Structure formats: structure tokens, C-alpha cells
Design an enzyme around this catalytic site. Structure first.
Site, mmCIF file in Angstrom:
data_model
loop_
_atom_site.group_PDB
_atom_site.id
_atom_site.type_symbol
_atom_site.label_atom_id
_atom_site.label_comp_id
_atom_site.label_asym_id
_atom_site.label_seq_id
_atom_site.Cartn_x
_atom_site.Cartn_y
_atom_site.Cartn_z
ATOM 1 N N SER A 1 0.612 -1.072 0.351
ATOM 2 C CA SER A 1 0.126 -0.433 0.034
ATOM 3 C C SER A 1 0.800 0.992 0.001
ATOM 4 C CB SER A 1 -1.152 -0.160 1.225
ATOM 5 O OG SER A 1 -1.810 -0.768 0.801
ATOM 6 N N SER B 1 -6.185 3.652 3.387
ATOM 7 C CA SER B 1 -5.916 2.838 2.543
ATOM 8 C C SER B 1 -6.769 1.641 2.119
ATOM 9 C CB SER B 1 -4.928 1.689 3.444
ATOM 10 O OG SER B 1 -3.520 1.252 2.347
ATOM 11 N N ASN C 1 -8.990 0.065 -0.672
ATOM 12 C CA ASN C 1 -8.307 -0.228 -1.897
ATOM 13 C C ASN C 1 -9.674 -0.033 -2.509
ATOM 14 O OD1 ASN C 1 -5.579 -1.296 -0.774
ATOM 15 N ND2 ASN C 1 -7.537 -4.135 -0.261
ATOM 16 N N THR D 1 1.964 3.707 5.187
ATOM 17 C CA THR D 1 1.711 2.248 5.862
ATOM 18 C C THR D 1 1.564 1.118 4.927
ATOM 19 O OG1 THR D 1 -0.249 1.898 6.551
ATOM 20 C CG2 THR D 1 1.604 2.388 8.507
ATOM 21 N N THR E 1 1.509 -3.188 4.384
ATOM 22 C CA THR E 1 1.138 -4.491 4.849
ATOM 23 C C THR E 1 0.928 -5.826 3.604
ATOM 24 O OG1 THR E 1 0.106 -3.718 6.855
ATOM 25 C CG2 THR E 1 -0.127 -6.161 6.577
ATOM 26 N N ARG F 1 5.629 -4.942 5.639
ATOM 27 C CA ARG F 1 5.502 -4.373 6.711
ATOM 28 C C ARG F 1 6.229 -3.163 6.460
ATOM 29 N NH1 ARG F 1 0.963 -1.428 8.717
ATOM 30 N NH2 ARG F 1 1.082 -1.711 10.450
#
Length: 265
Positions: free
Chosen positions: A44, A105, A107, A210, A212, A218
Site C-alpha cells: 500500500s 489505505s 483499496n 503504511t 502491509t 510491513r
């Protein structure tokens, strides 16, 4: 900075992890790095450069921030909290989608923007346009986050991405207004409280995005301002044996190692 290197190596050994880090100054000059040119899945983290691409288009007039992007339930994929909420209304604007991509984040919102800008090929073209010959987007979410070992699709390196962050925030890639907007979105990110910024001093101004991915990825990329000194940073980690919470803690630990280096100057 030998302490920097050896402290990161200690984390790597003890957590069975690989840690890629690059810290650069506003002009992209190297401050510190570890495995800085190893490729890692972006996951992401690409949503930040995606938003930059969107702002470039807004700046040029090829896109309009309040333009309404219509969609149906087909656009809802795993982790689409805002897109799900706006579904009944039938649209999100370009800016709503971009803010959700960056700060949640989301999607669905990310993929909605990809639909509008020309897909992964166009994202990759933008990286090239701003001098990043390394980062590549090949797929939409969530498959781009598969992180199959060895796969070069959907990867960057810490140094390439840190330089991309610097270009966007400090290197004039965007107008002053667009730059400020994206900076504030990064500061107000909702998903990073336990990662990099948890390891930085509480008076540093920090904004980040961030990531993942499957198979233990990460990541956290962004900027920090330590008093008057501005830096761009990219952290990518792979720790297949750690729990999700331990991976957060790993990135926060990298934040501490970064801090210890920065404070020494």
C-alpha cells in the site's frame, strides 16, 4: 551510524527479518541506508505516489479534484472502508478517493483512481516522469500486495522510494498548494500510529503511508521534520515469522534507530 547499521542488523537477526531503509535530505542526498537498493514489495505504500500523480494531474488541469467517480459494488474489495460507506451514494470524488487511499489505505478507492488514471502502466509512467527508474506498479489491489518471494512486480527500493517522497514533498513535483495538501494528509494518516511515527520523538512533524503485504511485508514511507531539518524516509521490512503486532513493533523499532542517528547530529 555504525550503531545504526549494527542496531538494524541486531533487529534483523533476532526477528528473522530483513529491513530496508533509506533516509534522504530534501534534495535526495543520502543520509543513511540499510539494504537500500534491495527490492521490496511496495504494497500500500504506492498509494502515496498515486495521490501525487493525481495532484500532478489536478495541477495541470487534466483532472479535477471534485470530479465525481461513479462505481458499483464490483469496486469493493478487501479493506475498502470508505468506498463501502459511499457506495449507496454511487460515487466518490477524485479528492475523496485520494484522501481515503492515503489515510485509510482504502483499496476500492485506490482502484477507482487507477481506473481513472490509466491503470498500473500509468502509475509506472509517473514514477519514470519524476526520475524514479525503479519503482513499478504492475497490478491493482489487493493482488499487488501478494509479495510472492522473488517477484519483481509491484516493487521499489528504499532509496528509490525515499527519493520519490523527497521529490513530491520538497523537489517541486507539485504546486505549493497540492504539496501542502498531500503533506497534511500524510500527517493525518489514520493507519500509522503503531509503526514508524511511534518510534520518533513526539515533537517531530511526521507524515507517512503504511503498507502491509502477504508473506510478512510491513512498510512505512514518508517524511519527518526534526526541528528545522527535513528528511524523507522509506522503510520496507520482511518478517514472515513475526505476528502482525510484532511487525508493527519492528517498524517502530526502526523508527527508534533512525531517531538515534538523527539526534546524534
Amino acid at each position: 551510524k555504525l550503531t545504526f547499521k549494527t542496531d538494524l542488523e541486531k533487529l534483523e537477526r533476532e526477528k528473522a527479518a530483513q529491513i530496508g531503509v533509506a533516509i534522504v535530505d530534501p534534495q535526495g542526498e543520502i543520509v543513511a541506508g540499510h539494504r537500500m537498493a534491495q527490492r521490496f514489495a511496495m504494497c500500500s505504500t504506492f498509494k502515496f505516489p498515486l495521490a501525487a500523480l493525481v495532484f500532478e494531474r489536478i495541477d495541470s488541469g487534466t483532472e479535477r479534484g471534485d470530479r465525481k467517480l461513479s462505481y458499483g459494488p464490483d469496486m469493493i474489495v478487501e479493506w475498502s472502508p470508505a468506498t463501502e460507506r459511499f457506495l449507496a451514494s454511487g460515487h466518490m470524488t477524485v479528492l475523496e478517493a485520494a484522501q481515503a487511499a492515503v489515510q485509510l489505505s482504502d483499496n476500492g478507492a485506490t482502484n477507482l483512481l487507477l481506473r481513472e488514471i490509466g491503470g498500473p502502466a500509468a502509475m509506472t509512467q509517473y514514477f519514470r516522469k519524476i526520475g524514479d527508474s525503479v519503482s513499478r506498479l504492475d497490478r491493482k489491489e489487493p493482488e499487488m500486495s501478494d509479495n510472492t518471494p522473488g517477484d519483481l512486480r509491484d516493487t521499489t527500493t528504499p532509496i528509490a522510494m525515499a527519493r520519490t517522497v523527497a521529490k513530491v514533498l520538497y523537489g517541486g513535483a507539485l504546486t505549493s498548494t497540492s504539496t501542502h495538501t498531500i503533506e497534511r494528509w500524510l500527517i493525518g494518516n489514520q493507519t500509522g500510529d503503531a509503526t514508524l511515527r511511534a518510534g520518533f520523538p513526539k515533537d517531530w512533524v511526521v507524515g507517512e503511508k503504511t503498507g502491509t503485504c502477504a508473506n510478512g511485508g510491513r512498510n512505512d514511507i514518508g517524511f519527518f521534520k526534526a526541528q528545522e531539518r527535513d528528511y524523507a524516509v522509506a522503510v520496507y521490512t520482511t518478517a514472515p515469522k513475526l505476528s502482525a503486532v510484532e511487525r508493527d513493533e519492528l517498524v517502530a523499532s526502526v523508527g527508534q534507530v533512525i531517531t538515534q542517528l538523527i539526534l546524534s547530529t
